[PDB]
Design a binder for this molecule. Sequence first.
Ligand SMILES: NS(=O)(=O)c1ccc(NC(=S)Nc2ccc(F)cc2)cc1
Ligand SMILES: [Zn+2]
Length: 258
Amino acid sequence: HHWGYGKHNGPEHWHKDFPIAKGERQSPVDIDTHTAKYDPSLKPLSVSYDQATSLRILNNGHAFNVEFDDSQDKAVLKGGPLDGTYRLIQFHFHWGSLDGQGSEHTVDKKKYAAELHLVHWNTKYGDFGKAVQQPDGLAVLGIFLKVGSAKPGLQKVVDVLDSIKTKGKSADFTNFDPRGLLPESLDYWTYPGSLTTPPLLECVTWIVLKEPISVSSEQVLKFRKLNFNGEGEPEELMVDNWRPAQPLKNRQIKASFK
Ligand SMILES: NS(=O)(=O)c1ccc(NC(=S)Nc2ccc(F)cc2)cc1
Ligand SMILES: [Zn+2]
């Protein structure tokens, strides 16, 4: 697999190796805020990150992932649309070459500068690899980023990026608290979807927060200094690593709020 985000290997090409790219529950999607309906059946959302144990940060050639110890129930997501318990495994971002693009989900066609994805797997399936084969295997918490004031809780991530510039580089990243990446409100939209990168598996319950977080121009500029390429290869800046909105088809987006 040589997929990426370029003209020659980007989202318009993915279907050839991954035919589910044209499936019935692909992500991301545009969230039409007028058509999303308030759902009183949604239980309260519970984000329990007090015991989260970060381990490492990795440039995987597509984004960077902050990885967690998921060998026990240390950082979990429950409630909302979810049945049972979902364990945090990693977070990553998608972002643009400029501040007017970068998010995967859109809100009434508005694109944000970036989007954070906190990835969790359903513990009833035992491991991540088994969970991704199930329709209710993952829950991804999506948070929009807009450019304005700096996000203090992001700065530790920004400051380590110089050490993982190129594909395959990693750095120890212990003691990072993901609580510092959340907005105040947990109001959200939810719908059934997919991974937004190959293999595009239709295993995700998406939970997209309504309230963006603010980050500074300086913070996002540092994301844009990363490289898709490996060390000693021609430089290709890691920007515009987002998939565009996909057809909603036979899905409804539910709102947790009135
Ligand atoms: N952008 S996203 O939808 O949140 C997203 C979240 C997670 C992943 N894949 C990961 S962590 N590894 C993986 C490896 C082998 C598989 F067969 C399936 C997934 C991709 C996209
Ligand atoms: Zn993602």
